[PDB]
């Protein structure tokens, strides 16, 4: 899927590269900080490979577990959102970041937030 | 029976609420049952004319984590529904936002869920 496949930027300095396969698969790499190979993590997810053609966005989601060969934050984030379509290339998401915790601290295991990604790097 | 009353979760917290005729919720949230230093003002709203088919009554409330003893520069909002029957319950999801700098704002908000009943856990 040419629309979703590519390099995406958030305003916070993070980027990700993704391939949207014909079978609904998303595969790629998420980079939390610019030019730092130690901040690169595997990303995998799914997208709707036959979206409505009525002007609606294309639903998608992906996960990054915050472990690579250099760092391990014992946590994982899932982004759930839609590829907007239309002239501006944009993915609008909400996300959940869960940390592995003991039972006593499970009530505060999860952060929630929102990210918007664009193919044109924000200024 | 109704929202007005004293409620408990299974993580040692309690709250005392009054559901007013004007749709207001007023009360106190005590984060550790029996520890008066853990009491904070609670204010919210509820649907004063809910559906009759067994659907829950929508409600929400906020607690800012400042009292005369402690200030954690944060606030939690619980959004949920009251469900009647033999063992009434309030089922909620919540958002706890802390005051942060702009650089740390991406990680300012926790999310969770709680269920409350009027029966104190044994």
């Amino acid at each position: 899927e040419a629309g979703i496949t590519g390099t995406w930027y958030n305003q916070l300095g993070s980027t990700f590269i993704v391939t949207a396969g014909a079978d609904g698969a998303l595969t790629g790499t998420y980079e939390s900080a610019v030019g730092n190979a130690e901040s690169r993590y595997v990303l995998t997810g799914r997208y709707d490979s036959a979206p409505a053609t009525d002007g609606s966005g294309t639903a998608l989601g992906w996960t990054v577990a915050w472990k690579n060969n250099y760092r391990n934050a014992h946590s994982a984030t899932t982004w759930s959102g839609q590829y907007v379509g239309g002239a501006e290339a944009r993915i609008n998401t909400q996300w959940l970041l869960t940390s592995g915790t003991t039972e006593a601290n499970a009530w505060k295991s999860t952060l929630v937030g929102h990210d918007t990604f664009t193919k044109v790097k924000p200024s | 029976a109704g929202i007005t009353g004293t409620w408990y979760n299974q993580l040692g917290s309690t709250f005392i609420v009054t559901a007013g005729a004007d749709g207001a919720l007023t009360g106190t949230y005590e984060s550790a049952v029996g520890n008066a230093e853990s009491r904070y003002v609670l204010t919210g709203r509820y649907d004063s004319a809910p559906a009759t088919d067994g659907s829950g009554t929508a409600l929400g409330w906020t607690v800012a984590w400042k009292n005369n003893y402690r200030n954690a520069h944060s606030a939690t909002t619980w959004s949920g529904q009251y469900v009647g029957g033999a063992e009434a319950r309030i089922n909620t999801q919540w958002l706890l936002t802390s005051g942060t700098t702009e650089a740390n704002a991406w990680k300012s908000t926790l999310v969770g869920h709680d269920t409350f009943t009027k029966v104190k856990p044994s």
Partner: peptide, 5 residues
């Protein structure tokens, strides 16, 4: 929610 929250 617990403790000071």
């Amino acid at each position: 929610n617990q403790x000071w929250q």
